[PDB]
Amino acid sequence: PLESQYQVGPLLGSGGFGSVYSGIRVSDNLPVAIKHVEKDRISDWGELPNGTRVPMEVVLLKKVSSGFSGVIRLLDWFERPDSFVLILERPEPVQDLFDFITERGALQEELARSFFWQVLEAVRHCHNCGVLHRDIKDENILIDLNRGELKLIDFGSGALLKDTVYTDFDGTRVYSPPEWIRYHRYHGRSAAVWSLGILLYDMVCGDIPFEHDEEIIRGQVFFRQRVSSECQHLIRWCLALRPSDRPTFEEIQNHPWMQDVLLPQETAEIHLHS
Ligand SMILES: CN(C)Cc1nc2c(sc3ccc(/C=C/C4CC4)cc32)c(=O)[nH]1
């Protein structure tokens, strides 16, 4: 045990959630990320199959970790007197979708579609595992620039998935649905689809559609860049004001604009200059 097996590199980011450092498992040189979370800043606790009292993030991480590389896997975790320390995988080289959009602006449709699909495949995986992320957005998506594979990260506002209503949200406002904004209630799926509508608008317009509460409640989408009619259709569908007017994952993934997606490898070859 102990803090022997890992070697702490540079800090990767921080905030009110905590601090993440680059790290190398000594045990065999694998890249990892070392995420330190303060007990005081966890509002949502959970408990394991094993039955111990851990942050919800750790519960959800365990339920989603396994073969499929569309979600970042949690390799191990530790407890400390005032924090939990999480060890997760780290692709090399890697960059987050937010930075990648800051650099390259609006993405070519073909690139967006391959990115969007992959997010769709990640979120479907979480939904199967009984996990709801609740904070899907460019900053919670890592690109592995060599293999062209997106990895969803940061379950710190997630919850167990359920069919009843959610009356709490501790995620990103500008990505939250209008039913949350007015009534303080949403349902998982439909609120996830809204965040995906936002995410796709982001990808294709270089930036997010709404900044203020009223623009959210109004739900009218102005396009600032050339975007095909079919992409515009899908975005507006995901951003239906009534939750039940929103598409299901299956309906999103059968949308005409979602056809003939590139593979992750082809994607890096053509767009990440692999
Ligand atoms: C997404 N934020 C709030 C923090 C956060 N970062 C990571 C995780 S796993 C993880 C794994 C790798 C890397 C490497 C990133 C490069 C772009 C700087 C970061 C993270 C998380 O769970 N939370």
Q: Is the peptide bond before 93 cis (omega within 30 degrees of 0)?
A: yes
Give me the CATH number covering residue 228: 1.10.510.10
Q: Is 89 annotated as a binding residue?
A: yes
**Which of 54, 69, 92 is at the close of a domain?**
92
Do 74 and 119 lie in one domain? The reply is no
Do 14 and 64 lie in one domain? The reply is yes
Q: How far is the CA of 154 from the centre of ligand 1 (A)?
A: 7
For the beta carbon of residue 28, count every other beta carbon within 10 angstroms: 7
Q: Is 156 annotated as a binding residue?
A: no
Do 132 and 143 lie in one domain? The reply is yes
Do 117 and 129 lie in one domain? The reply is yes
Distance CA 6, CA 34 (A): 9
Q: End-to-end alpha-carbon separation of the chain, Å? A: 38
Distance CA 8, CA 139 (A): 23
Q: How far is the CA of 39 from the centre of ligand 1 (A)?
A: 19
For 53, counting Cβ atoms within 10 Å of its Cβ (0-12 exposed, 13-18 middle, 19+ buried), the class is exposed
Contact 225, 204 (CB under 8 A): yes
Q: How many domains does the chain have?
A: 2
- Give the position of tokens 């979708």: 97
Do 136 and 208 lie in one domain? The reply is yes
Do 197 and 268 lie in one domain? The reply is yes
Structure tokens, 203: 């990808």
Structure tokens, 156: 């710190």
Distance CA 63, CA 248 (A): 22
Residues 6+ positions from 85 with CB-CB distance below 8 Å: 34, 35, 36, 37, 77, 78, 79
- What is the phi/psi pair of residue 50, to 5°? -35, -25
- Ligand 1 atom closest to the Cα of residue 156 is 22
Nearest CA to ligand 1 atom 23: 154
Structure tokens, 249: 């994952």
> Can 135 be counted among the known catalytic residues?
yes
Q: Which domain holds residue 212?
A: 93-274
Q: Which residues pair with 71 in a beta bridge?
A: 152
The 3-state DSSP class for residue 32 equals strand
- What is the phi/psi pair of residue 220, to 5°? -95, 130
Cβ < 6 A, ligand 1 pocket: 12-13, 17, 20, 33, 35, 72, 88, 90, 94-96, 139-140, 142, 153-154
The catalytic position among 40, 76, 135, 170 is 135
Alpha-carbon distances, residue 88 vs 111, 155, 182, 198, 254 (angstroms): 27, 12, 36, 27, 33
Q: How far is the CA of 153 from the centre of ligand 1 (A)?
A: 6
Structure tokens, 36: 């330190």
Taking 3-state DSSP, the helix, strand and coil percentages for the chain, each rounded to the nearest 5, stand at 40, 20, 40
